[PDB]
């Protein structure tokens, strides 16, 4: 498939920090297509959820400023601001925001994905479509990555990487 | 057009349900973001 990277420039669209449902219009109504995190004026989600499409609050436009297909990450309103890194052997929580469900934290001890590069945490939890972009947090309440890009095992199990970059 | 609606705060909850499994797998990530288990 194609790859791309975007890296950009801040605008002249204010949101409270926290975890958001990303919804899309009808007819029939709105449907959750994914999840994102607002931290320090920047909205962070996964590339495949929005594909760079304009977000809207109230209100007015919120436009992409940084994106990476390989990473499967995108940020609206500024560059990436989630700088926390997962440590090998530390347990994490996923704040899973599934369609039509209350948010719920799930604690897990990730395994590891070995690449030629290095190591990425592996989260063997299986949430419904629409919940990609849910944040993965550490003990300090800091986001170490986003959930929703992964692999299927030889046993049929779904296993997400911890999608993270390096902030700023 | 896409909309955004607040759901929760970024907070660790103390008595969280524990779940999942710790796999150790070799993968490649290609440029389009696809992860594949090394076969």
């Amino acid at each position: 498939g194609g790859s791309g990277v975007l890296w950009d420039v801040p605008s002249p669209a204010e949101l409270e920090e926290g975890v958001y449902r990303i919804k899309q219009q009808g007819i029939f109504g709105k449907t959750q297509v994914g999840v994102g995190v607002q931290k320090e004026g920047v909205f962070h989600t996964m590339w495949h959820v929005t594909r760079g499409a304009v977000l809207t609050h109230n209100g007015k436009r919120l436009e992409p400023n940084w994106a990476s297909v390989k990473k499967d990450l995108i940020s609206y309103g500024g560059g990436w601001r989630l700088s926390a890194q997962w440590q090998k052997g530390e347990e994490v929580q996923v704040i899973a925001v599934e369609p039509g469900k209350n948010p719920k934290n799930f604690q897990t001890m990730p395994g590891t994905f070995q690449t030629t590069t290095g190591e990425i945490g592996a989260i063997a939890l299986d949430f419904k479509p629409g919940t990609s972009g849910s944040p993965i947090i550490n003990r300090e309440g800091k986001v170490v990555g986003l959930y929703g890009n992964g692999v299927v095992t030889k046993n049929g199990g779904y296993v997400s990487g911890i999608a993270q970059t390096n902030a700023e | 057009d896409l909309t955004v609606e607040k759901a929760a705060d970024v907070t660790w909850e103390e008595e969280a349900e524990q779940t999942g499994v710790s796999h150790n797998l070799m993968i490649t990530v290609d440029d389009d973001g696809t992860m594949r288990i090394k076969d």
Partner: peptide
């Protein structure tokens, strides 16, 4: 499959 691979994505949520």
């Amino acid at each position: 499959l691979k994505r949520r």
